[PDB]
Amino acid sequence: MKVLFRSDSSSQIGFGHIKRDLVLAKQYSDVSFACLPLEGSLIDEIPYPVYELSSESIYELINLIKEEKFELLIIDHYGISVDDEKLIKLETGVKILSFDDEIKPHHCDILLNVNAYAKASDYEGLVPFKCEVRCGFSYALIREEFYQEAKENRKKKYDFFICMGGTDIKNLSLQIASELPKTKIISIATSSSNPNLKKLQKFAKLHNNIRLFIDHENIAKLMNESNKLIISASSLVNEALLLKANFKAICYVKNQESTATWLAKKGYEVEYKYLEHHHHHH
Numbered sequence: 001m002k003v004l005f006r007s008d009s010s011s012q013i014g015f016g017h018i019k020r021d022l023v024l025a026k027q028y029s030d031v032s033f034a035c036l037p038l039e040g041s042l043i044d045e046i047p048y049p050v051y052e053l054s055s056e057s058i059y060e061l062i063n064l065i066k067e068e069k070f071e072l073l074i075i076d077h078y079g080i081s082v083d084d085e086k087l088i089k090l091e092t093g094v095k096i097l098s099f100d101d102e103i104k105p106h107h108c109d110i111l112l113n114v115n116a117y118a119k120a121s122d123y124e125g126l127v128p129f130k131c132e133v134r135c136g137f138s139y140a141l142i143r144e145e146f147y148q149e150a151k152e153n154r155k156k157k158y159d160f161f162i163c164m165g166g167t168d169i170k171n172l173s174l175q176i177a178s179e180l181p182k183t184k185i186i187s188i189a190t191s192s193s194n195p196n197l198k199k200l201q202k203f204a205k206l207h208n209n210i211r212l213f214i215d216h217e218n219i220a221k222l223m224n225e226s227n228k229l230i231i232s233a234s235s236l237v238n239e240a241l242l243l244k245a246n247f248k249a250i251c252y253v254k255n256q257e258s259t260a261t262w263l264a265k266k267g268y269e270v271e272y273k274y275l276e277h278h279h280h281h282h
């Protein structure tokens with residue numbers, strides 16, 4: 001099939017949707033993306049045709065599907081609703097694979113929840129009658145380096161690895177690093193789309209126990225070189241699970257609660273305080 005991904009990335013949205021979509025894209029031969037141009041997006045990192053959307057109009061997406069005759073639409077977008085999915089189906093007849101991370105209803109032909117917590121039974125009554133439900137770690141979308149890395153034995157170089165996802169809008173990385181002993185060696189990974197980058201670099205430069213890695217190409221290596229991870233309850237969790245890492249999870253935003261709950265149940269430390277509004281910036 002000709003496949004279209006509808007997915008955004010930005011400083012605000014984070015990188016998780018596009019990054020996992022790029023792993024999924026390797027499953028298909030004729031791939032395109034439809035993206036809004038947004039500040040801090042990964043559009044320049046997407047090695048496929050990227051249709052630039054001029055608006056958030058669901059009809060603009062429908063027009064693109066009809067005109068280019070896409071046969072599979074992969075939706076990985078918290079802003080595309082069940083009603084939007086229904087409308088796409090009605091107007092185009094395209095097959096729809098929808099990502100879900102929170103246990104919400106979708107009108108799709110395949111429901112994909114790549115998170116370890118997820119069970120097909122979570123979606124009873126939440127999907128259409130002919131929907132194939134794909135849930136759990138057997139459907140993890142993880143970059144090759146993590147598989148390559150779970151094989152190698154590395155010497156530990158860091159006491160802690162901190163990664164709050166691609167962009168860390170609340171600057172939790174600074175707050176979290178500030179709580180740790182000055183004698184503990186701390187790696188921090190973030191991207192150049194982090195809107196707190198200048199402040200984080202200033203902070204890091206003052207503390208010789210902190211090593212900041214910007215736009216690092218091998219997060220797996222950094223994790224495997226670290227004794228303990230402190231990570232958001234996001235894509236990083238599946239990555240850490242594959243590497244059998246010791247980690248504490250931060251429930252960054254409400255959408256991460258399903259993962260957070262499961263991790264607590266499994267005996268991992270899970271921190272919820274940063275959900276509170278006074279932690280919106282550091």
Ligand SMILES: O=c1ccn([C@@H]2O[C@H](COP(=O)(O)OP(=O)(O)O)[C@@H](O)[C@H]2O)c(=O)[nH]1
Pocket residue numbers: 013014015016017019163164165166167168189190191213214215216219232234235236237239
């Ligand atoms: O500096 C970084 C920080 C994160 N990541 C990767 O980007 C993804 C972040 O997605 P996630 O769902 O964890 O968080 P989001 O960015 O959506 O908030 C994960 O696969 C990380 O391994 C990366 O390549 N470089």
Ligand SMILES: [Cl-]
Pocket residue numbers: 023026142143144145
């Ligand atoms: Cl890959």
